[PDB]
């Protein structure tokens, strides 16, 4: 289940291919990665880095998670932040994109340590 969570993370948060994001990117991606299937997910972040580029953050120095756990790691990546427009209803969900290179923090579990949870 360490792994199955890792898969869930990849699905929900990783698109290496996409460069940056516009509004139509989100609309498409949120639907494709199965986050509008029933209800529109308020807010989601997509990381635009290669999968291995990311897993490498699990080998940067540890820091303390929001929840007090010590398995969090920080790094600087390109992302698209998808936030729900409000003028969206379900399941015809609609989003406003926000591209930026920014700091992120991810929990890493398992052996080897793989990313399983987005903290910030």
Curated annotation (Swiss-Prot):
Active site positions, chain numbering? 13 (proton acceptor), 117 (proton donor)
Q: Is Protease tagged as a keyword?
A: no
**This protein's name:** Ribonuclease 4
The organism is Sus scrofa
Q: Please, which domain of life does this record's source organism belong to? A: Eukaryota
Which keywords does UniProt give here?
Answer: Antibiotic, Antimicrobial, Disulfide bond, Endonuclease, Hydrolase, Nuclease, Pyrrolidone carboxylic acid, Secreted, Signal
> What family does the entry list?
Belongs to the pancreatic ribonuclease family.
Parent-protein residues present: 29 to 147 of 147
Q: What does this protein do?
A: Cleaves preferentially after uridine bases. Has antimicrobial activity against uropathogenic E.coli (UPEC). Probably contributes to urinary tract sterility.
Q: Which GO terms describe its molecular function?
A: endonuclease activity; nucleic acid binding; RNA nuclease activity
- Entry-annotated residues carrying Pyrrolidone carboxylic acid: 2
State the compartments where it is located.
Answer: Secreted
Residues that bind dUMP, according to the entry? 8, 13, 41, 44-45, 118
Per the record, its GO cellular-component terms are: extracellular space
Transmembrane is among the record's keywords: no
So what EC number does this one have? 3.1.27.-
Q: Which cysteines are joined by disulfide bonds?
A: 26-82, 40-93, 58-108, 65-72
- GO biological process per UniProt: antibacterial humoral response; defense response to Gram-positive bacterium
């Amino acid at each position: 289940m360490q792994d199955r969570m890792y898969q869930r993370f990849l699905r929900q948060h990783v698109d290496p291919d996409a460069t940056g994001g516009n509004d139509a990117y989100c609309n498409l991606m949120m639907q494709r990665r199965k986050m509008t299937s029933h209800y529109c997910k308020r807010f989601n972040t997509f990381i635009h880095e290669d999968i291995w580029n990311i897993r490498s953050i699990c080998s940067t120095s540890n820091i303390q998670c929001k929840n007090g756990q010590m398995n969090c790691h920080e790094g600087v990546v390109k992302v698209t932040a998808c936030r729900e427009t409000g003028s969206s209803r379900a399941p015809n969900c609609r989003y406003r994109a926000m591209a930026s290179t920014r700091r992120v923090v991810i929990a890493c579990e398992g052996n080897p340590e793989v990313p399983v949870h987005f903290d910030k």
